Amino acid sequence: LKEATTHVTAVGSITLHFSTSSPQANFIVSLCGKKSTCNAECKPPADH
Amino acid sequence: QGKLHIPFRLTPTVCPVPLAHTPTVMKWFKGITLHLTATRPTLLTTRKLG
Amino acid sequence: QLHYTVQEEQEHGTFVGNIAEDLGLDITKLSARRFQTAPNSRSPYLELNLETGVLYVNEKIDREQICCLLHLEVFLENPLELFRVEIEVLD
Distance, in angstroms, between C90 CA and closest chain B CA? Predict the structure, then answer.
């Protein structure tokens, strides 16, 4: 990830940025210690 | 019988050197192309970071 | 690039110009940055104080031996910089 800590309210949403080297984005993120799994389909970059 | 000084010693100082025209990069897949403009011979060095 | 003037047949040790003041250099860090006269431009008629950065007349000025302008150069470290001083002599 790009960020290390975030400020959370009682309800809502937060956005994060991350860098990967895998053709797919399947990884476990922990927010406040609670884990979740992210699924995606990463595309190759345009910049050589 | 004696010793005489040798004048005009070699001292450090600052002095300018030219800065060449910076090249244009024409990057491509696992490679770069440098378009070099040099009115006088200038030294280019490259090395891989591995 | 620095412009200064002196009079004809001027006494030794007299004021010429404040280099550190005109360049905007701080006064308490000339020795830390190694203020020094450049070896290329050495003038027997001029001398500068390393601590204060004030140029002074060293030897008695004479147009017959000179002739015109007097050229001097200083260099500083951290960062490496060079400055030029030119003095006009009246008659």
Answer: 31
